[PDB]
Symmetry: C2
Subunit: 122 residues, 2 copies
Amino acid sequence: GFTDFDSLSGTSTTWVNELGSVMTIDVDRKGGVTGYYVNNAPGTGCRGLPYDLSGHAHGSTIAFSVVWSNGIADCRSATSWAGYARKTFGGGVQIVTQWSLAFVGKAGGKIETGQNVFTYQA
Amino acid sequence: GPFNAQGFTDFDSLSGTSTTWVNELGSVMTIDVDRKGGVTGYYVNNAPGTGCRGLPYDLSGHAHGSTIAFSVVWSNGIADCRSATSWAGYARKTFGGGVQIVTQWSLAFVGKAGGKIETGQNVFTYQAY
Protein backbone atom coordinates (compact mmCIF):
# COMPACT_ATOMS: atom_id res chain seq x y z
CA GLY A 1 0.00 0.00 0.00
CA PHE A 2 0.83 3.72 0.40
CA THR A 3 4.07 4.58 2.32
CA ASP A 4 4.63 8.33 1.52
CA PHE A 5 3.99 11.03 -1.10
CA ASP A 6 7.75 11.20 -1.98
CA SER A 7 7.69 7.71 -3.58
CA LEU A 8 4.87 8.86 -6.03
CA SER A 9 7.56 10.81 -7.98
CA GLY A 10 7.51 9.67 -11.64
CA THR A 11 3.98 8.18 -11.57
CA SER A 12 0.84 10.32 -12.11
CA THR A 13 -1.91 9.56 -9.51
CA THR A 14 -5.59 10.44 -9.73
CA TRP A 15 -7.70 11.36 -6.65
CA VAL A 16 -11.45 12.08 -6.22
CA ASN A 17 -13.26 13.89 -3.41
CA GLU A 18 -16.79 13.43 -2.01
CA LEU A 19 -18.18 16.04 -4.53
CA GLY A 20 -16.77 14.11 -7.52
CA SER A 21 -13.98 16.69 -8.12
CA VAL A 22 -10.90 14.91 -9.57
CA MET A 23 -7.24 15.84 -9.63
CA THR A 24 -4.22 14.21 -11.29
CA ILE A 25 -0.90 15.07 -9.59
CA ASP A 26 2.74 14.72 -10.70
CA VAL A 27 5.37 14.81 -7.92
CA ASP A 28 8.98 16.05 -8.73
CA ARG A 29 12.00 14.52 -6.92
CA LYS A 30 11.99 17.29 -4.21
CA GLY A 31 8.20 16.78 -3.51
CA GLY A 32 7.10 19.68 -5.71
CA VAL A 33 3.52 18.93 -6.92
CA THR A 34 1.96 20.01 -10.23
CA GLY A 35 -1.16 18.70 -11.99
CA TYR A 36 -4.71 19.53 -12.89
CA TYR A 37 -7.96 19.74 -10.97
CA VAL A 38 -11.53 19.40 -12.30
CA ASN A 39 -14.18 20.89 -10.01
CA ASN A 40 -17.61 19.17 -9.80
CA ALA A 41 -18.90 21.16 -6.76
CA PRO A 42 -22.68 21.84 -6.88
CA GLY A 43 -23.72 25.46 -7.56
CA THR A 44 -20.12 26.61 -8.43
CA GLY A 45 -18.70 28.16 -11.62
CA CYS A 46 -15.70 26.65 -13.50
CA ARG A 47 -17.07 23.05 -13.42
CA GLY A 48 -15.82 20.24 -15.70
CA LEU A 49 -12.64 21.84 -17.19
CA PRO A 50 -9.02 21.40 -16.03
CA TYR A 51 -7.30 24.02 -13.82
CA ASP A 52 -3.55 23.99 -13.06
CA LEU A 53 -2.64 22.85 -9.54
CA SER A 54 0.61 23.37 -7.64
CA GLY A 55 1.89 22.44 -4.20
CA HIS A 56 4.33 20.41 -2.12
CA ALA A 57 4.28 16.99 -0.44
CA HIS A 58 6.47 14.93 1.93
CA GLY A 59 5.90 11.85 4.06
CA SER A 60 2.22 11.81 5.08
CA THR A 61 1.30 15.49 4.38
CA ILE A 62 0.54 17.59 1.28
CA ALA A 63 -0.48 21.22 0.54
CA PHE A 64 -1.72 22.41 -2.85
CA SER A 65 -3.70 25.19 -4.44
CA VAL A 66 -5.73 26.03 -7.55
CA VAL A 67 -6.46 29.51 -8.95
CA TRP A 68 -9.81 29.25 -10.85
CA SER A 69 -8.59 30.79 -14.14
CA ASN A 70 -7.42 28.65 -17.14
CA GLY A 71 -8.02 31.02 -20.13
CA ILE A 72 -11.45 29.38 -20.75
CA ALA A 73 -13.46 30.33 -17.61
CA ASP A 74 -12.33 32.68 -14.80
CA CYS A 75 -14.14 32.29 -11.45
CA ARG A 76 -12.08 35.13 -9.83
CA SER A 77 -11.15 32.87 -6.88
CA ALA A 78 -8.49 30.57 -5.41
CA THR A 79 -8.72 27.46 -3.24
CA SER A 80 -5.92 26.01 -1.11
CA TRP A 81 -5.82 22.64 0.70
CA ALA A 82 -3.64 20.95 3.33
CA GLY A 83 -4.08 17.35 4.30
CA TYR A 84 -2.64 14.11 5.67
CA ALA A 85 -2.61 10.59 4.16
CA ARG A 86 -4.95 7.97 5.74
CA LYS A 87 -4.49 4.30 4.56
CA THR A 88 -7.77 2.32 4.04
CA PHE A 89 -8.57 -1.33 4.90
CA GLY A 90 -7.38 -3.38 1.86
CA GLY A 91 -4.47 -1.15 0.75
CA GLY A 92 -6.09 2.06 -0.51
CA VAL A 93 -5.35 5.64 0.62
CA GLN A 94 -7.19 8.93 1.19
CA ILE A 95 -6.03 12.56 1.71
CA VAL A 96 -7.99 14.13 4.63
CA THR A 97 -7.94 17.86 3.86
CA GLN A 98 -8.90 21.29 5.16
CA TRP A 99 -9.47 23.99 2.49
CA SER A 100 -10.01 27.75 2.05
CA LEU A 101 -11.65 29.51 -0.90
CA ALA A 102 -10.74 33.21 -1.38
CA PHE A 103 -13.00 35.37 -3.64
CA VAL A 104 -13.80 39.14 -3.96
CA GLY A 105 -17.64 39.49 -3.91
CA LYS A 106 -19.94 42.40 -2.88
CA ALA A 107 -18.67 43.26 0.66
CA GLY A 108 -15.03 42.96 -0.63
CA GLY A 109 -12.69 39.98 0.05
CA LYS A 110 -14.27 36.90 1.62
CA ILE A 111 -12.82 33.55 2.67
CA GLU A 112 -14.90 30.33 3.13
CA THR A 113 -13.49 27.11 4.65
CA GLY A 114 -14.37 23.42 4.78
CA GLN A 115 -13.12 19.86 4.50
CA ASN A 116 -12.59 17.47 1.51
CA VAL A 117 -11.47 13.78 1.56
CA PHE A 118 -9.73 12.61 -1.66
CA THR A 119 -9.55 8.85 -2.47
CA TYR A 120 -6.76 7.43 -4.68
CA GLN A 121 -8.24 5.94 -7.92
CA ALA A 122 -5.92 3.09 -9.01
CA GLY B 1 10.95 49.23 -13.21
CA PRO B 2 10.84 47.28 -9.87
CA PHE B 3 7.50 46.84 -7.94
CA ASN B 4 6.18 50.06 -6.27
CA ALA B 5 3.22 49.73 -3.77
CA GLN B 6 1.54 52.99 -5.09
CA GLY B 7 1.32 51.30 -8.56
CA PHE B 8 -0.42 48.15 -7.13
CA THR B 9 -3.91 47.61 -8.72
CA ASP B 10 -4.20 43.87 -7.94
CA PHE B 11 -2.00 40.72 -8.07
CA ASP B 12 -1.66 41.20 -11.88
CA SER B 13 0.64 44.17 -10.75
CA LEU B 14 3.10 41.57 -9.27
CA SER B 15 3.81 39.90 -12.69
CA GLY B 16 7.63 40.10 -13.31
CA THR B 17 8.33 41.25 -9.70
CA SER B 18 10.30 40.14 -6.68
CA THR B 19 8.72 41.12 -3.32
CA THR B 20 8.98 40.41 0.45
CA TRP B 21 5.95 40.16 2.77
CA VAL B 22 5.81 39.81 6.58
CA ASN B 23 2.93 38.45 8.68
CA GLU B 24 1.80 39.54 12.16
CA LEU B 25 4.39 37.19 13.94
CA GLY B 26 7.25 38.29 11.64
CA SER B 27 7.30 35.12 9.46
CA VAL B 28 8.59 36.13 5.97
CA MET B 29 7.63 35.15 2.40
CA THR B 30 9.94 36.19 -0.48
CA ILE B 31 8.14 35.67 -3.83
CA ASP B 32 9.06 35.95 -7.48
CA VAL B 33 5.89 36.25 -9.62
CA ASP B 34 6.42 35.37 -13.30
CA ARG B 35 4.76 37.14 -16.26
CA LYS B 36 1.80 34.63 -16.08
CA GLY B 37 1.09 34.93 -12.30
CA GLY B 38 3.19 31.89 -11.31
CA VAL B 39 4.42 32.28 -7.69
CA THR B 40 7.76 30.78 -6.62
CA GLY B 41 9.93 31.58 -3.64
CA TYR B 42 10.72 30.86 0.02
CA TYR B 43 8.83 30.96 3.33
CA VAL B 44 10.68 31.43 6.66
CA ASN B 45 8.77 30.48 9.82
CA ASN B 46 9.64 32.79 12.79
CA ALA B 47 6.46 31.94 14.86
CA PRO B 48 7.53 31.15 18.49
CA GLY B 49 6.77 27.67 19.89
CA THR B 50 6.69 26.16 16.33
CA GLY B 51 9.16 23.72 14.67
CA CYS B 52 11.24 24.40 11.46
CA ARG B 53 12.10 28.08 12.34
CA GLY B 54 14.72 30.18 10.51
CA LEU B 55 15.20 27.91 7.48
CA PRO B 56 13.87 28.62 4.00
CA TYR B 57 11.14 26.28 2.72
CA ASP B 58 10.13 26.18 -0.97
CA LEU B 59 6.84 27.97 -1.68
CA SER B 60 4.76 27.68 -4.82
CA GLY B 61 1.38 28.92 -6.00
CA HIS B 62 -0.36 31.34 -8.33
CA ALA B 63 -1.66 34.94 -8.24
CA HIS B 64 -4.48 36.27 -10.49
CA GLY B 65 -6.61 39.39 -10.23
CA SER B 66 -7.70 39.87 -6.62
CA THR B 67 -6.78 36.38 -5.28
CA ILE B 68 -3.64 34.41 -4.47
CA ALA B 69 -2.85 30.93 -3.13
CA PHE B 70 0.42 29.25 -2.13
CA SER B 71 1.68 26.06 -0.43
CA VAL B 72 4.68 24.92 1.69
CA VAL B 73 5.63 21.48 3.02
CA TRP B 74 7.75 21.72 6.23
CA SER B 75 10.53 19.42 4.93
CA ASN B 76 13.64 20.78 3.11
CA GLY B 77 16.27 18.06 3.76
CA ILE B 78 17.47 20.02 6.87
CA ALA B 79 14.43 19.89 9.23
CA ASP B 80 11.12 18.02 8.81
CA CYS B 81 8.09 19.07 10.95
CA ARG B 82 5.78 16.34 9.48
CA SER B 83 3.43 19.20 8.41
CA ALA B 84 2.12 21.11 5.39
CA THR B 85 0.50 24.58 5.12
CA SER B 86 -1.52 26.29 2.36
CA TRP B 87 -2.81 29.87 2.16
CA ALA B 88 -5.61 31.40 0.09
CA GLY B 89 -6.18 35.12 0.20
CA TYR B 90 -7.07 38.46 -1.30
CA ALA B 91 -5.30 41.84 -1.84
CA ARG B 92 -6.20 44.74 0.45
CA LYS B 93 -4.97 48.31 -0.06
CA THR B 94 -4.72 50.55 3.06
CA PHE B 95 -5.43 54.35 2.89
CA GLY B 96 -1.84 54.33 4.33
CA GLY B 97 -0.95 53.51 0.64
CA GLY B 98 0.31 50.08 1.88
CA VAL B 99 -0.55 46.63 0.43
CA GLN B 100 -1.65 43.57 2.41
CA ILE B 101 -2.68 39.97 1.66
CA VAL B 102 -5.47 38.74 3.96
CA THR B 103 -5.10 34.91 4.02
CA GLN B 104 -6.67 31.88 5.69
CA TRP B 105 -4.15 29.07 6.23
CA SER B 106 -4.92 25.31 6.28
CA LEU B 107 -2.46 23.19 8.31
CA ALA B 108 -2.14 19.39 8.30
CA PHE B 109 0.31 17.59 10.59
CA VAL B 110 0.95 14.17 12.09
CA GLY B 111 1.59 14.45 15.85
CA LYS B 112 1.49 11.97 18.79
CA ALA B 113 -2.34 11.57 18.19
CA GLY B 114 -1.98 10.99 14.40
CA GLY B 115 -3.27 13.22 11.53
CA LYS B 116 -4.76 16.63 12.48
CA ILE B 117 -5.98 19.61 10.40
CA GLU B 118 -6.31 23.23 11.57
CA THR B 119 -7.31 26.62 10.09
CA GLY B 120 -6.49 30.22 10.97
CA GLN B 121 -5.77 33.72 9.68
CA ASN B 122 -2.54 35.47 8.58
CA VAL B 123 -2.18 39.05 7.25
CA PHE B 124 0.97 39.68 5.16
CA THR B 125 2.29 43.24 4.76
CA TYR B 126 4.37 44.23 1.71
CA GLN B 127 7.87 45.42 2.81
CA ALA B 128 9.27 48.33 0.67
CA TYR B 129 13.06 47.60 1.05
